[PDB]
Amino acid sequence: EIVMTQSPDTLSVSPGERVTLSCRASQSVGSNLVWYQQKPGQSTRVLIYGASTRAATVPARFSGGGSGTEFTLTISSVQSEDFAVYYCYHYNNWPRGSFGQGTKLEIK
Amino acid sequence: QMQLVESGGGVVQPGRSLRLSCAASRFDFNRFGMHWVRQAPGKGLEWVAYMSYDGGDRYYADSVKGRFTISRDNSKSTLHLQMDSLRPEDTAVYYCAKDDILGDCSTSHCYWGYYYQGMDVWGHGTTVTV
Ligand SMILES: *[C@@H]1O[C@H](CO)[C@@H](O[C@@H]2O[C@H](CO)[C@@H](O[C@@H]3O[C@H](CO[C@H]4O[C@H](CO[C@H]5O[C@H](CO)[C@@H](O)[C@H](O)[C@@H]5O[C@H]5O[C@H](CO)[C@@H](O)[C@H](O)[C@@H]5O)[C@@H](O)[C@H](O[C@H]5O[C@H](CO)[C@@H](O)[C@H](O)[C@@H]5O[C@H]5O[C@H](CO)[C@@H](O)[C@H](O)[C@@H]5O)[C@@H]4O)[C@@H](O)[C@H](O[C@H]4O[C@H](CO)[C@@H](O)[C@H](O)[C@@H]4O[C@H]4O[C@H](CO)[C@@H](O)[C@H](O)[C@@H]4O[C@H]4O[C@H](CO)[C@@H](O)[C@H](O)[C@@H]4O)[C@@H]3O)[C@H](O)[C@H]2NC(C)=O)[C@H](O)[C@H]1NC(C)=O
Numbered sequence: 001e002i003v004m005t006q007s008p009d010t011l012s013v014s015p016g017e018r019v020t021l022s023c024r025a026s027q028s029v030g031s032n033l034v035w036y037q038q039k040p041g042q043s044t045r046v047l048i049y050g051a052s053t054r055a056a057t058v059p060a061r062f063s064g065g066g067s068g069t070e071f072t073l074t075i076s077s078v079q080s081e082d083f084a085v086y087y088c089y090h091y092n093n094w095p096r097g098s099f100g101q102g103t104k105l106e107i108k
Numbered sequence: 109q110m111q112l113v114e115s116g117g118g119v120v121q122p123g124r125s126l127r128l129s130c131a132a133s134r135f136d137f138n139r140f141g142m143h144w145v146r147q148a149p150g151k152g153l154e155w156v157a158y159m160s161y162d163g164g165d166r167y168y169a170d171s172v173k174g175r176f177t178i179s180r181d182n183s184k185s186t187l188h189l190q191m192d193s194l195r196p197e198d199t200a201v202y203y204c205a206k207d208d209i210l211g212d213c214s215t216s217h218c219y220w221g222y223y224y225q226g227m228d229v230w231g232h233g234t235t236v237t238v
Pocket residue numbers: 044045046047055056057058110134135136207208209210217222223225227228229
C-alpha cells in the first residue's frame with residue numbers, strides 16, 4: 001500500500017513571496033499525482049494533474065514538478081486568494097487512490 | 109450549473125443505518141463515475157467509495173468495507189449511499205465528486221494513464237455524527 005506524507009502541515013508565510021511545498025510517498029508512485037486545493041465555504045478545484053500539468057483557468061504562478069517519490073509544488077508571488085489548504089492525491093491503482101494529510105498556510 | 113447537491117445526515121446513535129443522497133444538476137449522470145469522500149474533524153480527507161458510470165464496478169476503502177453500499181440511478185440523476193452499523197469514528201462531513209474523464213473511453217482511446225484529470229466538480233458535503 002502507498003501513503004504519502006506532506007510537510008510541513010503548517011507554514012505561515014507573508015503574502016508576496018515564493019513558497020514551495022513537498023509531498024513524498026512511501027513507495028515510488030510514478031507520475032500519477034494530483035494537487036487539490038480547498039478553500040472553506042467554496043468547492044475544491046484541481047490545480048495540477050499528471051504530476052506536472054497546469055489545469056485550465058488556473059493562474060500562472062502555480063507550478064508542480066518532480067517524479068518517482070518526491071513531488072513538489074511552487075507558488076511564486078502568493079497573494080490574498082492563495083490562502084487555503086492543499087493536498088497531494090495519488091491514483092497509481094486507478095480508480096482507487098489515497099489522499100495526503102494537508103497543509104494550511106498562514107500569514108506571519 | 110455544473111453543481112451537485114447533498115441530502116441526509118444529522119444526529120444518530122450507533123448500531124443504526126442511514127442513507128445519503130447526492131443529486132446532480134445539469135451535466136450528465138450516465139457517462140461519468142462518481143466518488144464519495146469524507147473528512148473527519150481535525151483531520152484530512154479520505155476517499156471512501158467509487159462507483160462506475162454504468163454500475164459495472166464498485167469499490168470501497170477497507171475502513172467502511174462491508175457495512176457500506178453505494179448505488180446510483182441515472183434517470184433520476186442521483187447517487188445514493190447506505191451506511192449501516194455505525195461507529196463513533198464515522199463522525200465526519202461527506203461530499204460527492206465527479207470524474208474529469210468520460211467513462212466509456214477511459215480504457216480504450218481515452219486511457220487514464222495518459223489523459224486523466226482529477227476531479228473537476230465537488231459538492232458541499234453534509235455532516236454526520238455518531
Ligand atoms: C492527445 O493528447 C492531448 C494532450 O494530452 C489531448 O488533449 C487534451 O484532450 C482533453 C480531452 O478533450 C482536453 O480536455 C477537455 O477540454 C475541454 C475544453 O473546454 C473548456 O476548457 C476550459 C475549462 O476547463 C476547466 O473545466 C473543465 C471542466 O469543465 C476541466 O476539465 C478543466 O481541467 C478545467 O478545470 C477547471 O474547472 C473549474 C474552474 O473553472 C474547477 O472546478 C476545476 O477544478 C478546474 O480548476 C475553458 O477555459 C475552455 O475555454 C477556452 O477554449 C475554448 C475553445 O476550446 C474557447 O472558445 C474559450 O474562449 C477559451 O479559450 C481560451 O483558451 C484557448 C486555448 O484552449 C486560447 O487559445 C484562447 O485564446 C483562450 O485563452 C473550454 O471552454 C473541456 O470542455 C473538456 O471537459 C468536458 O469534458 C470532460 C470529459 O472529457 C468533462 O469531464 C468535463 O466536465 C467537460 O464536460 C462537458 O462537456 C462534455 C462533452 O461536451 C459534456 O458531456 C458534459 O456534460 C459537460 O458539458 C456541460 O458542462 C459545460 C460546462 O460549461 C457546458 O458548457 C455544457 O453545455 C454542459 O452543460 C475537457 O476538459 C484537454 O484540454 C486537451 N489538452 C490539451 C493540452 O489540448 C488529446 O485529447 C489527445 N488526443 C488523442 C486522440 O489521444
